[PDB]
From Swiss-Prot, chain B:
Described function: Required for the processing of the 20S rRNA-precursor to mature 18S rRNA in a late step of the maturation of 40S ribosomal subunits. Has a physiological role leading to 18S rRNA stability.
Principal location class: cytoplasm
Organism, as annotated: Candida albicans
Assembly and interaction partners: Component of the small ribosomal subunit. Mature ribosomes consist of a small (40S) and a large (60S) subunit. The 40S subunit contains about 33 different proteins and 1 molecule of RNA (18S). The 60S subunit contains about 49 different proteins and 3 molecules of RNA (25S, 5.8S and 5S).
Domain of life: Eukaryota
MF terms in GO: structural constituent of ribosome
Subcellular location: Cytoplasm
Record Pfam families: Ribosomal_S21e
GO CC field: cytoplasm; ribonucleoprotein complex; ribosome
Keyword rRNA processing: yes
Official protein name in the record: Small ribosomal subunit protein eS21
One GO term of the biological process aspect: rRNA processing
Family membership: Belongs to the eukaryotic ribosomal protein eS21 family.
Length: 150, 87, 184, 129, 208, 81
RNA sequence: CCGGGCGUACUGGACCCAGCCGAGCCUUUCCUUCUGGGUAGCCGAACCAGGACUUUUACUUUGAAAAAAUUAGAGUGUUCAAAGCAGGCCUUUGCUCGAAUAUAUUAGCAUGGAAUAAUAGAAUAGGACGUUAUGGUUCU
């Protein structure tokens, strides 16, 4: 495991066997959707909306209640971001490292980490082009990356 | 093993382990044959009348012979609630 | 008018006659006007009882689920020695052959595996399934085991045997229902 | 990564049978694994086995009775013509009178003796004896 | 199965706990895990003496199956068990091996005390490792009094008990002798009090 | 141990296992109904909450995220749902 | 199961135990068709022969094809044999078994099957059916 490390950690979530909403859950499939859109306009990514839902609203899974996954609901309401969230945070981290590197030119460790992040961007961007999430001519440019995320 | 006419051309049909069903070889000197006496309703051991189990030398070497007898004897009624299937 | 089928049988009319009688008490009346069903399949189970299967349009299933716990109890009173279950009439689409002409991609809800799992879920409605196991016996036959939650167990705990034969009638396979966490 | 779940399943069975255990847990499950186990069960090399549904690939618990000498996969699943089945049984099986080479044919998964009976051939899948 | 007269009586249970038989070693091996009932908060492991009793009854039934009583060999390298095995041999007719076990007694057929027992009974697998090792060379089954740290290799019948107790060793040996004679019919029934006292079979220091 | 019931593990030993190493993996977390001391308003809070949840009535932090389970503030009582 | 020297092949006779290789029909499961035969029974599949469509493979069965010589192999007293494709009959104004059969194998061709491994499909619906659904725009 760990594509870009020697780690073998297994920590992750373990979904319950039950695919139905808990008996104590009382919100409707609608009230969750308006809650998601309300939070989506505040700028939260699908990961953060799901964290807030279970943390403060008791929504264990948006799928077991609404019937669709969170990103599927946003894309159905024209609220899907242009760049996928995970690709956005990889590019944003690469932007931060590249900005740090120009002021710290002897930081050869940051140069090594930057190659890993950018290699991770290209593998993910290439995948998104085959599934037609990104345009076939979409290419990640290091020079113009700051425009996309900043 | 027998031929076409049905005669048992096999010599030495070997014994098999009671725990693992492995064949106990002719020179497996770690293998034993447990003989356990039958007890009548008076609490007396019945002379020359036994329950017999065989263990291969492999099972005994790993130290699992004791736990295998606990299981085998409990299924035959020689023991009660000493070996548990679920751990 | 309650029956969504042309030429209903006498049993369907009697059941719909009950359906036009449970709204008399206003605690459950605001919801029995739209309720309809397609068929009433009935089979004989051992012990002198008879299994009554009410078939419901799948889109109408979630409306029945809101009052099904109550509605069955009075329907079991009106028809004695009857075990009442509510099933949705899901459609099974056959697996396309290699030479078969291309059709629209078959949704998973229309697959035979999903439908048998779905009717296996509608059978035990008040309880929820917490685990399923399939035994493969040396004889060649295969037996399913479904484990049910102890919550709301009293609604089904005296039946289950009706479900096993009813499931066998519908699919031809063997299933055994067990509630591992009872008080016992 | 995990490239052959059948190889993982048979390796676990072999390790449990060689160590004298009468049961083994297999993860993940698949159709090929279940149909491979059914052939082993049909010839008496294993006992009853149980499938556990976890809303995932699944798990299997197999009961071993000590009659199994070795089961294994052939990776890759080579194409086998009918005239090549004889050569494969010579290399993989201990004798001409027992043991089975498992094939996947368009008529289904079956042992090499059944494949000759119905005159079908496919890709080799494994063996058991 | 077994008549209820063979169940663990309260009298024997009182003896086992007063002799500290139930005290098993701090660290338990994986093979002795089923015999542990619960770990005592100091660290000692409590032996399920109900399981201990049944193994004793099972062990005595194997001993009773040996035709020649002298063919049963009872062994003890610990000083705490030397008196027990010598008295066991006297009462049952078995062959006692107290103290040092000469290596080659089972394999070397020109040694002085070269024996061919049909069964070997061991006080402790750790301090009697030599006696157990040779039994695995000439197809001799082994019954062993095992603590929670005692090894279980080449041991067929394990009696879970405290191997490191002065009274534990003597009591277990006394119980086997009584049961073997009960099955043989020497003791008329399972309720008659035995003449021999568990104080006999106990090791005595040179002081007295 | 050569023979063992893998299909019916002891529930005591089954609970000591890692959450991914059970027969069917199951989360050990749960959701709670939190009563702040100041007022009485049902607020569903995840046991391992990563957010400083505040009740709607008064903007007071109910819990602080930690490495594992969220830590409830003083005067806050929880009941598992 | 009368076997008319284990013999036991032959074969009247299985009455088929089970097992094995099949084929359909029913279970929510049908080449959407089109044109007749042709119409028989309802209130075009009732089987053919002449048309219209078709997700792409890999794989595997069977068939045709892969020249003869060579190889394996059936027959045949070249005096045996290596070989050869001869030869055999009561002795012939002639009669007459033959000169087999297997193997080829990647590529190509036709074919049965659909496990295994890919592939395509209904997502801003520009999606599917209306067999005789209602119009409109073009085109043959
Ligand atoms: Mg890992
Ligand atoms: Mg890598
Ligand atoms: Mg993850
Ligand atoms: Mg009313
Ligand atoms: Mg069998
Ligand atoms: Mg070879
Ligand atoms: Mg063979
Ligand atoms: Mg075999
Ligand atoms: Zn508050």
């Amino acid at each position: 495991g760990r594509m870009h490390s020697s780690g073998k950690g297994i920590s992750s979530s373990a979904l319950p066997y039950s695919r139905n909403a808990p008996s104590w859950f009382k919100l409707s499939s609608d009230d969750v959707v308006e809650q998601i859109i309300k939070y989506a306009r505040k700028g939260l990514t699908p990961s953060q909306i799901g964290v807030i839902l279970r943390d403060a609203h008791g929504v264990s899974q948006a799928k077991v209640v609404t019937g669709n996954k969170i990103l599927r609901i946003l894309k159905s309401n024209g609220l899907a971001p242009e760049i996928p969230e995970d690709l956005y945070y990889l590019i944003k981290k690469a932007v931060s490292v590249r900005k740090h590197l120009e002021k710290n030119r002897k930081d050869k460790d940051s140069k090594f980490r930057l190659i890993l992040i950018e290699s991770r961007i290209h593998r993910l961007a290439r995948y998104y082009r085959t599934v037609a999430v990104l345009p076939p001519n979409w290419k990640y440019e290091s020079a113009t990356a700051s425009a996309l995320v900043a | 093993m027998e031929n076409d006419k049905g005669q048992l051309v096999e010599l030495y049909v070997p014994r098999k382990c009671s725990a693992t069903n492995r064949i106990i070889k002719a020179k497996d000197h770690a293998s034993v044959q447990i003989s356990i006496a039958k007890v009548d309703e008076d609490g007396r051991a019945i002379a020359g009348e036994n329950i017999t189990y065989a263990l291969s030398g492999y099972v005994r070497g790993r130290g699992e012979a004791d736990d295998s007898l606990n299981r085998l004897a409990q299924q035959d009624g020689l023991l009660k609630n000493v070996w548990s299937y679920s751990r | 008018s309650k029956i969504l089928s042309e030429n209903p049988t006498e049993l369907e009319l009697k059941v719909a006659q009950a359906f036009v009688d449970l709204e008399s008490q206003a605690d459950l009346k605001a919801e029995l006007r739209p309720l309809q069903f397609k068929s009433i399949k009935e089979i004989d189970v051992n012990g002198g009882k008879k299994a009554l299967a009410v078939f419901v349009p799948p889109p109408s299933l979630q409306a029945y689920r809101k009052v099904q716990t109550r509605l069955t109890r009075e329907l079991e009173k009106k028809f004695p020695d009857r075990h009442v279950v509510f099933l949705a009439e899901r459609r099974i689409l056959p697996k396309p052959a290699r030479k078969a002409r291309k059709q629209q991609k078959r949704p998973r809800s229309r697959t035979l595996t999903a439908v048998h799992d779905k009717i296996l879920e509608d059978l035990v409605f008040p309880t929820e399934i917490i685990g399923k196991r399939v035994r493969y016996l040396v004889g060649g036959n295969k037996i399913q085991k479904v484990l049910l939650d102890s919550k709301d167990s009293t609604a089904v705990d005296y039946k289950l045997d009706s479900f096993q034969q009813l499931y066998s009638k519908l699919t031809g396979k063997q299933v055994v229902f067990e509630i591992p966490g009872e008080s016992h | 990564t995990r490239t052959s779940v059948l190889a993982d399943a048979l390796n676990a069975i072999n390790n449990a049978e060689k160590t004298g255990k009468r049961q083994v847990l297999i993860r993940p499950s698949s159709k090929v694994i279940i149909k491979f186990l059914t052939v082993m069960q049909k010839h008496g090399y294993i006992g009853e086995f149980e499938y556990i549904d976890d809303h995932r690939s699944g798990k299997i618990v197999v009961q071993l009775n000590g009659r199994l000498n070795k089961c294994g996969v052939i990776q890759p699943r080579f194409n086998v013509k009918i005239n090549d089945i004889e050569r494969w049984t010579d290399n993989l099986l201990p004798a001409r009178q027992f043991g089975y080479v498992i094939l996947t044919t368009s008529a289904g998964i079956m042992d090499h003796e059944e494949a000759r009976r119905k005159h079908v051939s496919g890709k080799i899948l494994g063996f058991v004896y | 199965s077994l008549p209820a007269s063979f169940d663990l009586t309260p009298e024997d249970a009182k003896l086992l706990l007063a002799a500290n038989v139930h005290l098993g070693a701090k660290n338990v091996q994986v093979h002795n895990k089923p015999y542990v009932y619960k770990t005592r908060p100091d660290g000692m492991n409590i032996i399920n003496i109900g399981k201990t009793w049944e193994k004793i009854v099972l062990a005595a039934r194997i001993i009773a199956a040996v035709p020649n009583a002298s063919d049963v060999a009872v062994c003890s390298s610990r000083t705490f068990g030397q008196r027990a095995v010598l008295k066991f041999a006297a009462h049952t007719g078995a062959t006692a091996i107290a103290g040092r076990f000469t290596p080659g007694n089972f394999t070397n057929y020109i040694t002085r005390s070269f024996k061919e027992p049909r069964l070997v009974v061991v006080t402790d697998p750790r301090t009697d490792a030599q006696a157990i090792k040779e039994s695995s060379y000439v197809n001799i089954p082994v019954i062993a009094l095992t603590d929670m740290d005692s090894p279980s290799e080449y041991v067929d019948v394990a009696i879970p008990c405290n191997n490191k107790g002065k009274h534990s060793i003597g009591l277990i040996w006394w119980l086997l002798a009584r049961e073997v004679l009960r099955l043989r019919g020497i003791i008329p029934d399972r309720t008659t009090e035995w003449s021999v006292m568990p104080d006999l079979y106990f090791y005595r220091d040179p002081e007295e | 141990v050569l023979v063992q019931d893998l299909l019916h593990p002891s529930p005591a030993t089954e609970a000591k296992q890692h959450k991914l190493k059970t027969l069917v993996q199951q989360p050990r977390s749960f959701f709670m109904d939190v009563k702040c001391q100041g007022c009485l308003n049902i607020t569903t809070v995840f046991s391992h909450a990563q957010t400083a949840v505040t009740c709607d009535s008064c903007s007071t932090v109910l819990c602080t995220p930690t490495g594992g389970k969220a830590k409830l503030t003083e005067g806050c009582s929880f009941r598992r749902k």
